[PDB]
Amino acid sequence: PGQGIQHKGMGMEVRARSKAARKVWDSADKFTRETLGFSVLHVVRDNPTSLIASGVHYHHPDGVLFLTQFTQVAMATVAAAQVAEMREQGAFVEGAIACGHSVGEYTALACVSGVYELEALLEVVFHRGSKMHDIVPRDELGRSNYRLAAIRPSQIDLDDADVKDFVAEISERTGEFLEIVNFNLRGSQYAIAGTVAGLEALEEEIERRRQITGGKRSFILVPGIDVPFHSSVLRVGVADFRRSLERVMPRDKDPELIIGRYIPNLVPRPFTLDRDFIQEIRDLVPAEPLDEVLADYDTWRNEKPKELCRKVVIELLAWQFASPVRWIETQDLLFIEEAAGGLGVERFVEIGVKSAPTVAGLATNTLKLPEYSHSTVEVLNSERDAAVLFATD
Amino acid sequence: DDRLAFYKQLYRDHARFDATLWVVPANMASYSDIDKLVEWVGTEQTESL
Amino acid sequence: LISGLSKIGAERDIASRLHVVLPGSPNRGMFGGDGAYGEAKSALDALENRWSAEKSWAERVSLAHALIGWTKGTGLMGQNDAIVSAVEEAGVTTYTTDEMAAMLLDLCTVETKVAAAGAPVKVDLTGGLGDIKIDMAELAAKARE
Amino acid sequence: LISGLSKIGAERDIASRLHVVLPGSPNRGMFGGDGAYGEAKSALDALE
């Protein structure tokens, strides 16, 4: 799962019991204390207000745990520790296909494929948080001319193509900026960022289009997000983060654990290293390291493949900043791959403790509407369903 | 208040921009004071209405 | 008090070094007339050892040692004020409160702050009262008398 | 204790000098491992 459901003392019960959880937390907490002069344990355990770090000063009236430079770190460590325990009990299956939503994708790769050290994971994730704060213009009050909004196309007869249409029209019409940021659920969840007036005009449209609306149905504005990220406005700051990734993500890694198991955001379809796949990336995200590899695929000599996967993996993570996260396609893709590979019993488990109910509830409603085919499916959450995860009952 | 008025006099003279002064009753002979004082010095910076 | 602010700094997790200026008494052992300052503050050298011993105190607290020389206040030293000129005749310096305050701030400058972060800084703010050959058995007592 | 035996000596009026051997710890500051002796006994110079 992604950010925003994080709670004070999340997964702190597991830390007191599991040994694997302690090693994940302590190795992470020690590094952060020595390098950046602060502890993630304290932040998670009791939520502070202001914090001063090495070069930076973070102040929030509510909590620092809800600040992204921290929140992402907390969320990543919580999940990484929970999977480690699941791995210690051997409950992790050898053929498990894994994916993540936004910041959760970094944890996904960390847990299943071990693509970075525990301290290495919290470096990228922390810096990615600090990178998300300085990207967009602000006022004296820290105001934004933009915002984000959550759409539900349902309750009326409207489709994904109908939503895309209406948004594209009002985007061109007013001359303002309106972008569909997140494709989450087929007929259920969509996120949209751009000019506030554009968000308002879009809110207005469905209220007019839907015949039954007296209450401004189907539209939820997002508090706290001032950045129209995952739109066409963010593509500038990738190159610096793309280098930062290559520093913290070296070339000795497991290709197979990622391939076919991992579903990027920028790329809705499963990771595989092929001339076909690398091209799909370039099309969505034009890039210098990628376009050359596509130009000559005749580099076939066996020294390449791991080195190829290592850059492709980083390209997906670096430009994940820019490209919209497709959760719809991620879910639907799983159906596509199963159907071609057989439909027999599947178990869907979400990890990260209290973040687990979200994308499961996202899956649950998705398992209903397109998936009506009557399939045996199990939706399991680390927070809620733990008795089922460890099979103890 | 004779001690309290003095620090007000001292502040209104030598205070620059960004300057904030804090005056408190304190006893360094009391361990309770020390613990209670820094527990006050280190908590939040928040005012709940 | 040092331990208290060390806990807060560690619990709330700051790497910021609190600079504690230790109000050392000037030049212990070469004055017999003070009766209070000279003896009490000599264990500050032993306190600098505690920080040099305890490992985790470095990030929370830095020890800046300042030896505060002869400094003229009105209330306590109202007897000592007349012989301030007399002691100053030995080629030694006695300080006004504003002068000594300035000496204490200079330890709080960025240059000397970083110096304290690398290692404990012992500063002699005394006016040369150390090599003083003036007999305190007389020139202090008589002054007080 | 020193003051106590000083009173007795003065009250009962003896000029006899009580020799108090002060159990000083060896060479303060050049050992960091004792942890007790080295620091405590350095004030015996102040007691002199």
Side-chain angles (χ1 to χ4, degrees), chain A residues 334-346:
Chain A
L334 296 175
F335 298 100
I336 298 172
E337 302 287 346
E338 293 294 340
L343 214 35
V345 175
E346 49 183 26

Side-chain angles (χ1 to χ4, degrees), chain C residues 52-139:
Chain C
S52 75
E54 302 168 1
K55 305 178 181 180
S56 59
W57 261 22
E59 296 291 343
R60 269 72 79 181
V61 166
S62 294
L63 300 188
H65 187 71
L67 303 158
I68 289 82
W70 199 284
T71 312
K72 172 182 171 180
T74 304
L76 308 175
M77 297 188 53
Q79 298 180 3
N80 307 326
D81 298 340
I83 61 115
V84 164
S85 59
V87 179
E88 198 157 304
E89 292 164 2
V92 206
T93 303
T94 60
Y95 300 92
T96 66
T97 59
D98 291 335
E99 282 174 335
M100 265 302 308
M103 299 298 290
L104 296 160
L105 303 165
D106 297 334
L107 316 183
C108 304
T109 55
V110 184
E111 310 175 18
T112 53
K113 283 180 59 177
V114 182
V121 180
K122 179 174 182 177
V123 189
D124 192 272
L125 302 175
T126 331
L129 297 166
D131 46 335
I132 268 199
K133 292 137 186 173
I134 281 186
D135 299 329
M136 301 260 72
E138 294 185 358
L139 296 193

Side-chain angles (χ1 to χ4, degrees), chain A residues 37-39 42 51-52, chain C residues 11-15 60:
Chain A
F38 77 95
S39 164
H42 175 73
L51 185 99
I52 165 180
Chain C
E11 291 175 359
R12 198 171 36 128
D13 301 289
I14 52 96
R60 269 72 79 181

Side-chain angles (χ1 to χ4, degrees), chain D residues 7 12 14 17 21 23 25 32 34 38 41 43 45-48:
Chain D
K7 298 169 187 176
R12 198 171 36 128
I14 52 97
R17 283 182 168 83
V21 165
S25 139
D34 341 333
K41 303 284 185 168
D45 286 337
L47 188 62
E48 293 171 7

Side-chain angles (χ1 to χ4, degrees), chain A residues 178-198:
Chain A
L178 205 65
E179 315 273 359
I180 318 196
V181 154
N182 290 133
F183 295 87
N184 298 328
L185 285 68
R186 178 184 173 178
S188 177
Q189 298 191 3
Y190 290 86
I192 286 220
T195 305
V196 171

